[PDB]
Amino acid sequence: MLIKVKTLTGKEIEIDIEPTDKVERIKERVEEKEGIPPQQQRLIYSGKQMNDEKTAADYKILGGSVLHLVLALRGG
Amino acid sequence: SVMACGVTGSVSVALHPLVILNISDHWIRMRSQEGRPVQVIGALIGKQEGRNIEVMNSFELLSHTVEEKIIIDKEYYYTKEEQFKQVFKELEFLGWYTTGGPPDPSDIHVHKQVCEIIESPLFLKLNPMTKHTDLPVSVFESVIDIINGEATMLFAELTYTLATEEAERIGVDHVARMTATGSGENSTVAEHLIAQHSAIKMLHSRVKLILEYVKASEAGEVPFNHEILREAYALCHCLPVLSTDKFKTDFYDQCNDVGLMAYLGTITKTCNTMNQFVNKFNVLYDRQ
Amino acid sequence: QKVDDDRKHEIEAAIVRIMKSRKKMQHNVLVAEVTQQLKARFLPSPVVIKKRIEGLIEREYLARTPEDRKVYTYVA
Amino acid sequence: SIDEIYKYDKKQQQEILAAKPWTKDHHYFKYCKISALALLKMVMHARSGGNLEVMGLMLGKVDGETMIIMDSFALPVEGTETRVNAQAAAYEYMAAYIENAKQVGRLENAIGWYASHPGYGCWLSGIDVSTQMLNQQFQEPFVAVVIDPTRTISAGKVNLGAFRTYPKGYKPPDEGPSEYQTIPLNKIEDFGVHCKQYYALEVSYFKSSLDRKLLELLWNKYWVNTLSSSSLLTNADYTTGQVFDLSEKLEQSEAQLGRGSFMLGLETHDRKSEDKLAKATRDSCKTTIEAIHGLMSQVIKDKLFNQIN
Ligand SMILES: [Zn+2]
């Protein structure tokens, strides 16, 4: 399935996601599109902050799921 | 009776304005959300050095009323304890706070759930519906007393002090100034004169205490308090601080400078009013 | 390989330290001001703090114009 | 109603966020209302930072052309931002705190960010402008607040500014008082490069129960030494710079009026000239009334103390 995480780019970047994959792999996928290390990245979905070791299927994320995570910036 | 009689404070508690500020915000929002002034419950954090306790910060806690008792989400408190660890490690948990009047048979239930967490928790209660000029904040400690053969936990009032850093003093002082003068110069000298009015009330209260002591000593008390009386005499000797030509000259100099500045400001306001009037006057009858 | 690894870690520490201070410099005022703001001096080794800010000229964030050093793009 | 501002209307906020009136005008947001709690917390954080810059997030809401602020909170900065930006484990504590506030009540969401400039004034640097431009592209309703703990002590009054950036390519109108500020030589170049890429909001309060309590308490507690001389305005710096700015603005208005007197039929020029004169007059009046209040307090207290009897 493809999910449209609202990565900070002005649009919802669509990425390849499998239900079994851990949600921490989603953080790396966004960094491949942006450049934010997963430590500063904070996945948030449906108003609740997503976990790290929990799988995506446990959150019932489908192909129409629009995510809104809070990443970071490149200060110094 | 949940209050201990004849028990004196064993530790010194230092409170900061931020703690009082957090309690006020917590009570206001809960009142706004749920009508009546719903009681709030939070936690106290800070630094403790032996018997000296300094409460520097305070956060809010989750409360669940089941079976007509307050159950604090200690797991939420534990979740928040590591949350505040990530930002500040020097601050340690010290106690919990609440809002209300005299202690009720629900705060003892709350306090015992805070006593099982840490060794010695502190209890603070704020009264948002007070009417006196005194601070409606009191700090109580946990004491075990044998009442009717049964160990009953009681609350002993602590003679806490008010700790504040130069920065907090200056920042809150600017807060006071922002209320004294309104955004659009509203209530200009209302709170200004009231501030000096309260300072003069404090000084007058000190003076009346001294005068009452002197009058009592004239009839009874100690005939001669030695140090106190001699020092009060020397202190009135400073009531007429008294000056010379140079100090009066400098005072009149500063007064004249500020008066000239005030005259310039009045001239600026008057010329702005004149400009507005001329702008309208070029409109109603005049052309071009 | 010892001196290669020895130089590898000290240049890595050199860049990490300077981006923390992160101020604009004319040619020589901050490159000496950053050294006194470290833990144990002499570790900086100025020979590397000059050629790696000169190695930073290929990109932005103190692009460090080559001749008249003054355009230190202070925007990132 | 003093406490009316504390009422949160979620649907009304959603309606405003769906309407997006700020897209119709880049000068839409003109006022910044800050709660006493917010101000205190921010100033305390800035001064604990000492001579080092700190930052945080502001929680609040919007109301017409006004942005409101209520809360603020530190983010784990292990090793003083050893990574990119002052975030590290940022939304870790942030999102937890946010869910925790939806749990304990606080429902006001992110309205902006605050940053500290210890001893170098309130303005936006190049880095600050890039940061705020990004914030104005994702969380459109965002405000860059800058504080100054060292000037807070020097001048006495808290040095605080609220700012919003202009979009890339967009030019500000001629109208612009631009108060003068002392900027150190190591910062003045960057200041000058970016000073026209943003504008300053009018920062105002509204009293409140939070104010009433806090103010009264600390005031009495520490002001027993009510003297503090009586004129912390004695330092030329602030007053002198303000008067210089006033003079510059009025002289610019005169130069404009002199050139506009030749053009017959330019109403916009008259409009901006009148507005600039009026702004100059109110600034002068506020300075004058502050000085008058200082003199009043000085006179009353000095007369009471010196020759009461
Ligand atoms: Zn800045």
D134 with A75: Cβ contact below 8 A: no
- D contact set with C (CB within 8 A): 80-82, 125-127, 129-130, 186, 189-190
Alpha carbons C37 and D284: distance in angstroms, whole number: 44
For tokens 């800070």, what's the residue? B46
Three-class secondary structure of residue D59 per DSSP: strand
Inter-helix orientation angle B17-33/D36-48, to 10°: 150
Domain of residue A22 covers: 1-74
- Distance (Å) from CA C29 to ligand 1 centroid: 22
Q: Which helix or strand (DSSP H or E) is residue A33 part of?
A: helix A23-33
* Residues from chain A contacting residue C20 (CB–CB below 8 Å): 76
The token duo for B190 is: 């209302």
What single-letter amino acid sits at B69?
A: K
Return the number of other C-beta atoms located less than 10 Å from residue C10's C-beta.
15
- Decide: A32 and A43 in contact? Cβ < 8 Å: no
Contacts of C75 (CB under 8 A, 6+ apart): C60, C61, D126, D127, D129, D130
Burial, B37: exposed, middle or buried (Cβ in 10 Å; 0-12, 13-18, 19+)?
Answer: middle
- The CA distance from B79 to the nearest CA of chain D, in Å, is 9
- Cβ contact B–D (≥3 pairs, < 8 Å): yes
Alpha carbons C24 and C62: distance in angstroms, whole number: 8
β-pair partners for B70: B65
- Cβ contact A–D (≥3 pairs, < 8 Å): yes
Q: Which helix or strand (DSSP H or E) is residue A27 part of?
A: helix A23-33
B206: contact with D, CB 8 A cutoff: no
Return the number of other C-beta atoms located less than 10 Å from residue D97's C-beta.
23
Q: What CATH number has the domain bearing residue A55?
A: 3.10.20.90
- Distance (Å) from CA D41 to ligand 1 centroid: 18
Contacts of D112 (CB under 8 A, 6+ apart): D57, D58, D60, D67, D69, D135, D142, D143, D144, D145
Alpha carbons B103 and B96: distance in angstroms, whole number: 14
Alpha carbons A56 and A68: distance in angstroms, whole number: 15
Query: To 10 degrees, the CA torsion angle through D180, D183, D185, D188?
Result: -70
Alpha carbons B158 and B122: distance in angstroms, whole number: 10
Q: Which helix or strand (DSSP H or E) is residue D55 part of?
A: strand D55-63
- Distance (Å) from CA D125 to ligand 1 centroid: 5
- Decide: B63 and B91 in contact? Cβ < 8 Å: no
Return the number of other C-beta atoms located less than 10 Å from residue D122's C-beta.
22
- Decide: B180 and D216 in contact? Cβ < 8 Å: no
Q: Which helix or strand (DSSP H or E) is residue D143 part of?
A: strand D143-148
Instruction: Name the neighbours of B, counting chains with at least 3 Cβ pairs within 8 A.
Output: D
D81 with A74: Cβ contact below 8 A: no
Distance of CA A47 to the CA centre of its chain: 13
Which residue from C minimizes the CA distance to A76? C19
Distances from the Cα of B223 to the Cα of B211, B217, B228, D140, D213, angstroms: 15, 6, 12, 76, 43
Alpha carbons D33 and D21: distance in angstroms, whole number: 19
Alpha carbons D309 and D306: distance in angstroms, whole number: 8
Alpha carbons C11 and C14: distance in angstroms, whole number: 5
* Residues from chain D contacting residue A75 (CB–CB below 8 Å): 81, 84-87, 127, 131
For Cα atoms D99, D103, D106, give the angle at the middle one, nearest 5 degrees.
Answer: 85
The token duo for C47 is: 């020979």
The token duo for D239 is: 């007053």
Alpha carbons B276 and B274: distance in angstroms, whole number: 5
- The CA distance from C2 to the nearest CA of chain D, in Å, is 27
- The CA distance from D141 to the nearest CA of chain B, in Å, is 23
A49 with D84: Cβ contact below 8 A: no
- The CA distance from D127 to the nearest CA of chain C, in Å, is 5
Name the region of D265 (left: φ>0; alpha: ψ -120 to 50; beta: rest).
left
Distances from the Cα of A52 to the Cα of A44, A60, B78, B83, C54, angstroms: 11, 15, 19, 17, 40
- Distance (Å) from CA D66 to ligand 1 centroid: 23
* Residues from chain B contacting residue D298 (CB–CB below 8 Å): 254
Q: Which of B71, B60, B110 is nearest to D100 (CA)?
A: B60
- Decide: D138 and D236 in contact? Cβ < 8 Å: no
- Cβ contact C–B (≥3 pairs, < 8 Å): no
Q: Which of B92, D298, B17 is nearest to B25 (CA)?
A: B17
Q: Which of D135, D136, D110, D132 is nearest to D123 (CA)?
A: D132
Q: How was this structure determined?
A: cryo-EM
* Residues from chain C contacting residue A72 (CB–CB below 8 Å): none
B174 with D224: Cβ contact below 8 A: no
Contacts of B218 (CB under 8 A, 6+ apart): none
**Which of A12, A40, A43, A74 to probe the D interface (max D CBs under 10 A)?**
A40
Q: How many domains does chain A have?
A: 1
Q: Which helix or strand (DSSP H or E) is residue A29 part of?
A: helix A23-33
Radius of gyration in angstroms for the set of CA atoms belonging to chain C, rounded to a whole number: 13
C16: contact with A, CB 8 A cutoff: no
C&D contacts, CB < 8 Å: 20
D127 with C75: Cβ contact below 8 A: yes
Three-class secondary structure of residue A15 per DSSP: strand
Three-class secondary structure of residue D283 per DSSP: helix
- Decide: D57 and D91 in contact? Cβ < 8 Å: no
For Cα atoms B94, B87, D48, give the angle at the middle one, nearest 5 degrees.
Answer: 85
Three-class SS of chain B? CCECCCCCCCCEEEECHHHHHHHHHHHHHHHHHCCCCCCCEEEEEEEEECCEEEEEEEEECCEEEECCEEEECHHHHHHHHHHHHCCCCCCEEEEEEEECCCCCCCHHHHHHHHHCCCCCCEEEEECCCCCCCCCCEEEEEEEEEEECCEEEEEEEEECCEECCCHHHHHHHHHHHHHHHCCCCCCCCCHHHHHHHHHHHHHHHHHHHHHHHHHHHHHHCCCCCCCHHHHHHHHHHCCCCCCCCHHHHHHHHHHHHHHHHHHHHHHHHHHHHHHHHHHHHHHHHCCCC
- Decide: D75 and D127 in contact? Cβ < 8 Å: no
> Residues D76, D78, D79, D83: is their CA dihedral positive or negative?
negative
Identity of the residue in D223, D285, D292 whose CB atom sits nearest the CB atom of B199: D223
Q: How many residues does chain C have?
A: 76
What single-letter amino acid sits at B240?
A: P
Three-class secondary structure of residue D265 per DSSP: coil
> Residues B67, B72, B73, B74: is their CA dihedral positive or negative?
negative
- Cβ contact D–C (≥3 pairs, < 8 Å): yes
- The CA distance from C40 to the nearest CA of chain A, in Å, is 22
D307: contact with B, CB 8 A cutoff: yes
Structure resolution, Å? 4.2
Alpha carbons D210 and D39: distance in angstroms, whole number: 11
Q: HSE-up of D58 (CA within 13 Å, CB side)?
A: 32
Burial, A7: exposed, middle or buried (Cβ in 10 Å; 0-12, 13-18, 19+)?
Answer: buried
β-pair partners for D170: none
DSSP for C5-72, please give it. Answer: HHHHHHHHHHHHHHHHH----SSSSHHHHTGGGSSSTTSS-HHHHHHTTSGGGGSSSS---SSSTT--
The token duo for B121 is: 């928790």
For strands B137-147 and B150-158, give the pairing. Answer: antiparallel
Please, where are the H alpha helices in chain D?
Answer: 10-19, 36-48, 90-104, 126-138, 149-155, 185-194, 209-223, 236-260, 267-306
Distances from the Cα of A60 to the Cα of A50, D28, D219, angstroms: 12, 41, 55
Instruction: Name the neighbours of D, counting chains with at least 3 Cβ pairs within 8 A.
Output: A, B, C
* Residues from chain B contacting residue D309 (CB–CB below 8 Å): 239-240
For tokens 């890429």, what's the residue? D197
The dihedrals phi and psi of B277, each to the nearest 5 degrees, come to -65, -40
What single-letter amino acid sits at D291?
A: A
